[PDB]
Amino acid sequence: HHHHHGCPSQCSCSGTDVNCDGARASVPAAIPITTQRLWLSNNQLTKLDPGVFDSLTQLTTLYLSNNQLTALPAGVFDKLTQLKELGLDQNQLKSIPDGAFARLPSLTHVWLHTNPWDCQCTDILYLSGWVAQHSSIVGEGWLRSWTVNPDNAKCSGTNTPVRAVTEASTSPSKC
């Protein structure tokens, strides 16, 4: 269509890219269901509505980096089965809900660094096992600077890698 495109206010859209980075506290409504790449980085997010992404089944890239996310809701990524890139770095996450990445078989780039992962608490063990089993996709940087480095998901206060934590060192009382 001549000089006509199909976009959330304060975001910029082109093709199936939706750039909502840096608009500032909640995920905008009416992100098109055909969206393949979604930037939600550099906003004010401290939580997500459960189900917020459930209609965006064609997503291949999702950036949530550099928010202040304190927790993710269980199942929040369950519908994003075509996701290849998932950015969660530079947030305030202490653990990942059990099973959160289980339905994401196509991941090739995952960013988890610069979060205060709480490795003494029982709830770290899903993430510890996941990183240990998917080490070749956990990294840092972008394009020319992309480098895999699974030890950059680090335990707050000791800087030990999250993937080295096993059940016998954790305690429910530290949650």
Author numbering: -5 to 0, 2 to 19, 21 to 171
Any passages from the paper?
As antigen receptors, the lamprey utilize a family of highly diverse proteins called variable lymphocyte receptors (VLRs), which contain multiple, tandem leucine-rich repeat (LRR) motifs. The resulting VLRB protein is a 15–25 kDa, crescent-shaped protein with a continuous beta sheet where its concave surface forms the antigen binding site. Herein, we report on the characterization of a lamprey VLRB that is specific for terminal 3-O-SGal, and was isolated from a lamprey immunized with human type O erythrocytes. This VLRB, termed O6, is the first reagent to our knowledge that specifically recognizes the 3-O-SGal determinant on glycoproteins with high sensitivity. To better understand the molecular determinants of glycan recognition, we determined crystal structures of unliganded (apo) O6 and a co-crystal structure of O6 in complex with (3 S)Galβ1-4GlcNAc. This O6 VLR is relatively small compared to other characterized VLRBs, containing 178 amino acids (~19.2 kDa) and only a single LRR variable domain (LRRV1) along with the other usual LRR and CP components (LRRNT, LRR1, LRRVe, CP, and LRRCT).
